[PDB]
Amino acid sequence: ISIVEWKPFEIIILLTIFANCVALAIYIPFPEDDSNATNSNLERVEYLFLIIFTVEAFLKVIAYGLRNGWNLLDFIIVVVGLFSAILEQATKDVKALRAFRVLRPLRLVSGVPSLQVVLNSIIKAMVPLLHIALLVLFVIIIYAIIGLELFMGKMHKTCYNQEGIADVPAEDDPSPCALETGHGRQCQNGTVCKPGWDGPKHGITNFDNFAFAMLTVFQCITMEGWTDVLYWVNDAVGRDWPWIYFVTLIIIGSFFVLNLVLGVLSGEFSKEREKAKARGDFQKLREKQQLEEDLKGYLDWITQAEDIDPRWNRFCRRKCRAAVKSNVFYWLVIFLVFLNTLTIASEHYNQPNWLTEVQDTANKALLALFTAEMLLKMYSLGLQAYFVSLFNRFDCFVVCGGILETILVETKIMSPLGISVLRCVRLLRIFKITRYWNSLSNLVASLLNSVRSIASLLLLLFLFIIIFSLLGMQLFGGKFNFDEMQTRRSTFDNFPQSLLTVFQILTGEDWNSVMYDGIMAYGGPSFPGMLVCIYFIILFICGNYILLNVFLAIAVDNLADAESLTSAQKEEEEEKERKKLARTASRIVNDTIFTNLILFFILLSSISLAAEDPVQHTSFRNHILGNADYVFTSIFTLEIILKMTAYGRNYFNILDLLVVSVSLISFGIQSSAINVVKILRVLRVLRPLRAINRAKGLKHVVQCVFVAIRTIGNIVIVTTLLQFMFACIGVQLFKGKLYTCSDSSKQTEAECKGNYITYKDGEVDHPIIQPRSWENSKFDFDNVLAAMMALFTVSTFEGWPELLYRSIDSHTEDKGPIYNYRVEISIFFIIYIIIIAFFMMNIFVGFVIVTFQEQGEQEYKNCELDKNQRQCVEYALKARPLRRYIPKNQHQYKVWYVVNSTYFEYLMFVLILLNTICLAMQHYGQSCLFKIAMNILNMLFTGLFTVEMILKLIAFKPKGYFSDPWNVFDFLIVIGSIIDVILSETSITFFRLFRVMRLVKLLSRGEGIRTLLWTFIKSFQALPYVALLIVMLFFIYAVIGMQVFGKIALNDTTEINRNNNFQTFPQAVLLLFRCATGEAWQDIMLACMPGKKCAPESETEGETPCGSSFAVFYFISFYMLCAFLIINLFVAVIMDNFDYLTRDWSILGPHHLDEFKRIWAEYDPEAKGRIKHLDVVTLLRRIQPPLGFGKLCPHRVACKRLVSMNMPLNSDGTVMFNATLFALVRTALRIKTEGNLEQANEELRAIIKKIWKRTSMKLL
Ligand SMILES: CC(C)CCC[C@@H](C)[C@H]1CC[C@H]2[C@@H]3CC=C4C[C@@H](O)CC[C@]4(C)[C@H]3CC[C@]12C
Ligand SMILES: CC(C)CCC[C@@H](C)[C@H]1CC[C@H]2[C@@H]3CC=C4C[C@@H](O)CC[C@]4(C)[C@H]3CC[C@]12C
Ligand SMILES: CC(C)CCC[C@@H](C)[C@H]1CC[C@H]2[C@@H]3CC=C4C[C@@H](O)CC[C@]4(C)[C@H]3CC[C@]12C
Ligand SMILES: *[C@@H]1O[C@H](CO)[C@@H](O)[C@H](O)[C@H]1NC(C)=O
Ligand SMILES: [Ca+2]
């Protein structure tokens, strides 16, 4: 019984769990205690489910008498279920603790054991991501205290009219202003900046205390709605200083933390790859490839001799086999597939009548030919030889689908969805002529071999989304019903809608807009109501982790196997071909000063180009640097002339000519405004690029990026090919359907003319006449190019929820929207994001990582010296003892003993934390007593810290105190905090930001953090030219945008406003930074479309001549290029720091030997390294075992062995430091034998690590 269980008592319980999961989805949360019959039936099925669970709990309890975590989860689920049922019966919130049933779907993981393994693989590589979760916590706290000492309470005023107010006439979205004494936004002509305002977003986005700032900093770190906060601060305090906060916050907490996380994950995924390689899981894929090749390579013997004729069907088969494989049916079927793609991609909205007949007759004349080829494939090759090859099973699928989908279209049952578009996948056969086919086939082979892993990793992601959908639906079900007219399409009302909302939060787009709604649904910016943001924070930070541990893992662990498979094929082909052939047949220009001065002049010209006035034309600034170009080109013209005589042509020299030329052929037009000038000026922007050839190190990175982009071409091509098919499907589904009338009552263009009355702010007593306009969506699936653009801006995760809910409403061509007509059409978008936004954009990053790893693994000197032994011997050869400065004076000795110990350091580490806590309690609306208490507390803390500084200066003396890098930054904080006090007793805030900087001392202590940060910082410093490509790209694109879109008028109702414009180089760079962050960049692109008003200053013809059609190729290309360059820099840093990222810490290394160096300490002061004799005899006693030894007996055979390890060329009296080092390194690992003393000296000297005679101190 209590052991009888059985086997079928689990499978029954699992089915009950699934039934509970389904019954939890049909439930509909109603707004205000409403209900229907289905909910009443589910409330009684819950009783049966609880009875079953209680019976299970009791039976399992009496078999064991529960220590397992899963059993504990079951127990605490059933107990709280009983509690909820009893409380509901008693009270006849009780209906809030039913949110423990959304935890029942977790029992599915308990049931199937193939998912427990994957769940452990998921939350086991999270422990490494705990030194990057603490750095994030420190950065958020530091920036929240800094923005609290800078922006506390400064965003509580807005324009209010000068009549009957209390309303904010600052338009539908009010923005903070400033009184006419500061430098913030000034109210309009007929408005007044008055205090007494709630806040920018109902009071949730503020810096009023260390609860509202900790959330604003997190939201800005997630790179969502950070420009909104930056602009709100810009409209409240000024525009000069606030950008330094929000730019550094994202550079450090969103572009460096992301790099750290990516590096740790990519180094963590390589250890398991090594473990699998040691176990030998790649062999199974290796054998399957060759055996399948031979199992198809030997079928020709059967098929070529199946029709031996010693009735007469040989008439055709003896030539059908040749004809269909004679390089004619290849280039003819490819041509037919090209024609089919032509007829599929030529369908737009409102096409001519002949085109729809051409595409109706070709779609049949080509299907007939493909079916004829189908029957010929079955005949000339045989049935089995047809269904061997993978491409030959998908082609049968496509042809049978075409045949079965013509019927549905001709019989008028369902509307076309796109089926023949899968025939364009056959265009991949073009790769067979080049070498980019073995890798592509191998990648698909690995993807198909790993299916029980992909479909199992996606199952936990689906379970996560389902669980967080039911929990969110219980929390916010029906509570999003606000009085305002907006329907709030992203709610938690049903299961499909709550799934869409959770998926949108997972992608991250507008994740803060849903949380701002879930906060007001539980009250407002109050204490208990706002504790609901923990749901969204946890969902975001635990969904974007599984989204990087499920997709990047697949991409990396499959693309690493694909490379090994391709290498195997290449090696086998090379060996076989080699065997076959062998077996069968047997001037002052070149000076430094000129180059350096020309490089300096290049920078001068670039800065002169970046300082031009975009909007203004007749200005003095556009004259001086419009005149310095005259002299500037004179030097550059000269430079070519006297260097021409040294030659009689490299491509860089041709570029420098071109450049010098434009300039030249420009101030000579001196008349032809006729564009020309204005299309020859936007070509000076090539100046920076003439420094590539004169800045060796900058040419190398350009060449490396060119090799990288040549290598990654297959991924881009097969991603564009897939996006094309998705665009064609979108055209089939949504052509001419996403049209809307301004009046939401007319569903026809002929019905959408005239005017209509709209009521402002949903007030029936405030009528307003507005015109009726039949308008399309911002991005529409009308033709194939518009579909491509819309899908691109969907894959960038920008504005995709708007397009999704506009596509859901569309029902018929030339008709308006219908609320939630086809919600099921969201599957198209979900699939697109899953494939083209989560999988294919991670395959590219995995490919970059794998290629860089292969480049780094090329030879590595390939000569012994195990991967740690290089550093071990290098350190044993270039390690010197460290200074200690034991005080000589007897009093200074006691003082330095006081400040050198755990007590003083750990008490300072407590005072620092107390000071930060005291800095954290700073609300908006503090009493005078609170503030004057804070002042005295700050004075006391700074007095204590300056007394600590005095003590340290006295103990360590002024060279010793100042030598430590951490005691020179402590001096600056003390001076700033000591200037702060005196200036507070009568630019004062610049010194108030010094005290909060003392918190970094706590981040300094403790390994892990201090090692990862240092290694990544020195990796960023080791590659200063990879990060200069991004600077060059930003400069060039900012100048181009400045020249093109400079003159667009700044209306605050559009996306080119006072805050976002191209009218200055800093502002253009900020706009490009925002676009790189991916913050409504498509809105800026649309606001830069042709047909806008020019600025009043920039010069009738001025109807709408501002804005160019260049915006598409500007913004899309900038996005792609910036993403490529950022990923290049990230992976370059990761691979430069790939020793720390995978170190296998159970072995010796820098951690186990820098300890040594220290452990020498005592037995040494200033350098020297001479032993006490009694050190070599007390060693192990402190040294740790996994490196040296474990506190055991000095004569332990193994420790006496440490004595057997004797003089390595020195003197027993005083070991020359390094001595013991090597000795300990040699005994720890790579133990050699007797007589291998100069043999080791040549084991290093003969290949690498030039000794430089140093063996004078190490011989034997
Ligand atoms: C190799 C294949 C995929 C090439 C595809 C190109 C052809 C089929 C497509 C791509 C973009 C298409 C154009 C997109 C938009 C318009 C505007 C309108 O006036 C209808 C026709 C027209 C002009 C389309 C004609 C067909 C078109 C040119
Ligand atoms: C841990 C993840 C999965 C979910 C986190 C949910 C828990 C920790 C949070 C999120 C939403 C929170 C609720 C939000 C608002 C209110 C209303 C008020 O009466 C105070 C408590 C109460 C009811 C909170 C209790 C705690 C709560 C339920
Ligand atoms: C990226 C490399 C080129 C460094 C950039 C430095 C140069 C191009 C930048 C840095 C500081 C900038 C200046 C900062 C402030 C102003 C005042 C503004 O009213 C007109 C532009 C002007 C005068 C900027 C021109 C461009 C500028 C000189
Ligand atoms: C934005 O620009 C001006 C500023 O008032 C004005 O024409 C209008 O508000 C906006 N432009 C258009 C074309 O609506
Ligand atoms: Ca966004």
Coordinates of N, CA, C and O in Angstrom, one line a residue, residues 972-1013:
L972 N 40.9 61.7 -1.2 CA 40.0 62.6 -2.0 C 38.6 62.7 -1.4 O 38.0 63.8 -1.3
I973 N 38.1 61.5 -0.9 CA 36.7 61.5 -0.3 C 36.8 62.3 1.0 O 35.8 63.1 1.3
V974 N 37.8 62.2 1.8 CA 37.9 63.0 3.0 C 37.9 64.5 2.8 O 37.2 65.2 3.4
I975 N 38.7 64.9 1.8 CA 38.8 66.3 1.5 C 37.5 66.9 1.0 O 37.0 67.9 1.4
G976 N 36.8 66.1 0.1 CA 35.5 66.5 -0.3 C 34.5 66.6 0.8 O 33.7 67.5 0.9
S977 N 34.5 65.6 1.7 CA 33.7 65.6 2.8 C 34.1 66.6 3.9 O 33.3 66.9 4.8
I978 N 35.3 67.0 3.9 CA 35.7 68.1 4.8 C 35.5 69.4 4.3 O 35.3 70.4 5.0
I979 N 35.5 69.6 2.9 CA 35.1 70.8 2.3 C 33.5 70.9 2.4 O 33.0 72.0 2.6
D980 N 32.8 69.8 2.4 CA 31.4 69.8 2.4 C 30.9 70.4 3.8 O 29.9 71.1 3.8
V981 N 31.5 70.1 4.9 CA 31.1 70.5 6.2 C 31.2 72.0 6.3 O 30.2 72.7 6.7
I982 N 32.3 72.6 5.9 CA 32.5 74.0 6.1 C 31.6 74.8 5.2 O 31.0 75.8 5.6
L983 N 31.5 74.4 3.9 CA 30.6 75.1 3.0 C 29.1 74.9 3.4 O 28.2 75.6 2.8
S984 N 28.8 73.9 4.3 CA 27.4 73.7 4.7 C 27.2 74.4 6.0 O 26.0 74.3 6.6
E985 N 28.1 75.2 6.6 CA 28.0 75.9 7.8 C 27.6 77.4 7.5 O 27.6 78.2 8.5
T986 N 27.3 77.8 6.3 CA 27.0 79.1 5.9 C 25.9 79.2 4.9 O 25.1 80.2 4.8
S987 N 27.6 75.1 -6.6 CA 28.4 73.9 -6.9 C 28.7 73.2 -5.6 O 29.8 72.6 -5.5
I988 N 27.8 73.2 -4.6 CA 27.9 72.5 -3.4 C 27.6 71.0 -3.5 O 28.2 70.2 -2.8
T989 N 26.8 70.7 -4.5 CA 26.4 69.3 -4.6 C 27.5 68.4 -5.2 O 27.5 67.2 -5.0
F990 N 28.5 69.0 -5.9 CA 29.6 68.2 -6.5 C 30.4 67.5 -5.5 O 31.0 66.5 -5.8
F991 N 30.4 68.1 -4.2 CA 31.2 67.5 -3.2 C 30.3 66.6 -2.3 O 30.9 65.9 -1.4
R992 N 29.0 66.6 -2.4 CA 28.1 65.7 -1.7 C 28.0 64.4 -2.3 O 27.5 63.4 -1.7
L993 N 28.6 64.2 -3.5 CA 28.6 62.9 -4.2 C 29.8 62.1 -3.8 O 30.0 61.0 -4.4
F994 N 30.7 62.6 -3.0 CA 31.9 61.9 -2.6 C 31.7 60.9 -1.5 O 32.3 59.9 -1.5
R995 N 30.8 61.2 -0.5 CA 30.6 60.3 0.6 C 30.0 59.0 0.1 O 30.4 57.9 0.6
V996 N 29.1 59.0 -0.8 CA 28.5 57.8 -1.3 C 29.5 56.9 -2.1 O 29.3 55.7 -2.2
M997 N 30.6 57.5 -2.6 CA 31.6 56.8 -3.3 C 32.4 55.9 -2.4 O 33.1 55.0 -2.8
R998 N 32.3 56.1 -1.0 CA 33.0 55.2 -0.1 C 32.5 53.8 -0.1 O 33.2 52.9 0.4
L999 N 31.3 53.6 -0.7 CA 30.7 52.3 -0.7 C 31.5 51.3 -1.6 O 31.4 50.1 -1.4
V1000 N 32.3 51.8 -2.5 CA 33.1 50.9 -3.4 C 34.2 50.1 -2.6 O 34.7 49.1 -3.1
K1001 N 34.5 50.6 -1.4 CA 35.5 49.8 -0.6 C 34.9 48.5 -0.2 O 35.7 47.5 -0.2
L1002 N 33.7 48.4 0.1 CA 33.0 47.1 0.4 C 33.0 46.2 -0.9 O 33.1 45.0 -0.7
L1003 N 32.8 46.7 -2.1 CA 32.9 46.0 -3.3 C 34.4 45.5 -3.6 O 34.6 44.4 -4.1
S1004 N 35.4 46.3 -3.1 CA 36.8 45.9 -3.3 C 37.1 44.7 -2.5 O 37.8 43.8 -3.0
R1005 N 36.6 44.5 -1.3 CA 37.0 43.4 -0.4 C 36.3 42.1 -1.0 O 35.2 42.2 -1.5
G1006 N 37.0 41.0 -0.9 CA 36.4 39.7 -1.3 C 36.8 39.3 -2.7 O 36.5 40.1 -3.6
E1007 N 37.4 38.2 -2.8 CA 37.7 37.7 -4.2 C 36.4 37.4 -4.9 O 35.3 37.4 -4.4
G1008 N 36.6 37.0 -6.2 CA 35.4 36.8 -7.1 C 35.1 38.1 -7.7 O 35.3 38.3 -8.9
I1009 N 34.5 39.0 -7.0 CA 34.1 40.3 -7.5 C 35.4 41.1 -7.9 O 35.5 41.6 -9.0
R1010 N 36.4 41.1 -7.0 CA 37.6 41.9 -7.3 C 38.5 41.2 -8.3 O 39.3 41.9 -8.9
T1011 N 38.3 39.9 -8.6 CA 39.1 39.3 -9.6 C 38.4 39.4 -11.0 O 39.0 39.7 -12.0
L1012 N 37.0 39.2 -11.0 CA 36.3 39.3 -12.3 C 36.4 40.8 -12.8 O 36.7 41.0 -14.0
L1013 N 36.1 41.7 -11.9 CA 36.2 43.1 -12.4 C 37.5 43.5 -12.9 O 37.7 44.2 -13.9

